[PDB]
Amino acid sequence: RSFNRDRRIFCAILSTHSRTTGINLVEADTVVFYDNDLNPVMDAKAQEWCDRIGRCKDIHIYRLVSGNSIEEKLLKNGTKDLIREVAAQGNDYSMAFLTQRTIQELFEVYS
Amino acid sequence: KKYEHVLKCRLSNRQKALYEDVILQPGTQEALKSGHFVNVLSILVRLQRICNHPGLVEPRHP
């Protein structure tokens, strides 16, 4: 509310693991996603709340990525699907859901 | 209205050094060759935390 009422505070810095995305009004007109979130429930709630802000008025959303790092690979929905696959009965298995090809080819540098 | 932007940022030399150190450690290479979900997850919770800012993995002490 302080950030909404006062037009001088340039940016509100916000954590994806916060809970009160139930607040419908945020006055600022851009969002920067500094990082990806490995946990997909937090990621989904963060995106959904940012799209709610975008519905309230036009915004620019910004996604930063390191060019050569693994973060480009986490951008793909398949990595989230990997975590989703491991989420089912991830206690009694051998923790070998990540196949060797998937691990190596997800990170390996190619021309 | 919604406009999507993805911006590529070049990692610094200190970030490159810590990144190559974590990758080339044998404890990472063995996990890559053999495979284990918790080990790869820990490798990423290291490497991406480096990738955000190397001060979270080794802060500059006074």
Side-chain angles (χ1 to χ4, degrees):
Chain A
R1 182 181 292 123
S2 183
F3 182 70
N4 289 344
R5 68 170 60 163
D6 193 335
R7 192 50 172 84
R8 300 175 302 126
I9 297 161
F10 173 72
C11 66
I13 69 178
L14 297 183
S15 66
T16 60
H17 302 179
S18 63
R19 303 292 69 174
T20 49
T21 57
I23 303 300
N24 293 313
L25 180 60
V26 183
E27 195 281 316
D29 52 345
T30 76
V31 186
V32 184
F33 288 84
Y34 187 72
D35 51 28
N36 211 317
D37 202 342
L38 280 157
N39 201 327
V41 176
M42 305 292 199
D43 174 56
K45 289 182 180 184
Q47 169 162 322
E48 180 168 38
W49 186 62
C50 287
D51 193 288
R52 193 184 297 210
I53 296 167
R55 295 160 205 171
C56 296
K57 63 177 178 180
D58 303 336
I59 64 174
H60 296 261
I61 58 164
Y62 269 103
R63 307 285 184 151
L64 302 181
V65 67
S66 182
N68 309 91
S69 81
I70 301 190
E71 196 178 46
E72 189 197 58
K73 325 300 181 192
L74 180 54
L75 191 64
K76 303 184 180 184
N77 305 310
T79 312
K80 300 179 186 176
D81 285 344
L82 301 184
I83 303 173
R84 288 174 171 145
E85 159 85 358
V86 187
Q89 284 83 39
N91 182 84
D92 307 356
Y93 278 72
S94 194
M95 313 293 102
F97 297 92
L98 309 181
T99 63
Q100 287 83 14
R101 193 171 189 189
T102 303
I103 296 168
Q104 286 171 14
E105 286 192 348
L106 189 66
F107 304 152
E108 193 157 48
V109 181
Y110 297 122
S111 180
Chain B
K1 304 180 185 179
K2 167 175 181 171
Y3 321 119
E4 291 190 353
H5 288 287
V6 182
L7 181 59
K8 276 191 170 186
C9 313
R10 191 177 188 186
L11 80 168
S12 79
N13 292 307
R14 188 183 170 107
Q15 281 192 303
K16 189 195 298 168
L18 284 161
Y19 174 88
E20 189 168 52
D21 183 279
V22 158
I23 283 180
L24 289 189
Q25 272 187 41
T28 299
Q29 196 57 229
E30 182 166 38
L32 296 174
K33 182 181 178 181
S34 63
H36 195 293
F37 171 76
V38 184
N39 296 354
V40 177
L41 179 61
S42 182
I43 287 155
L44 271 52
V45 172
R46 290 175 180 176
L47 182 150
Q48 295 175 206
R49 192 155 61 197
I50 290 161
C51 186
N52 276 354
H53 194 276
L56 297 202
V57 179
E58 48 165 37
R60 290 178 182 269
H61 306 285

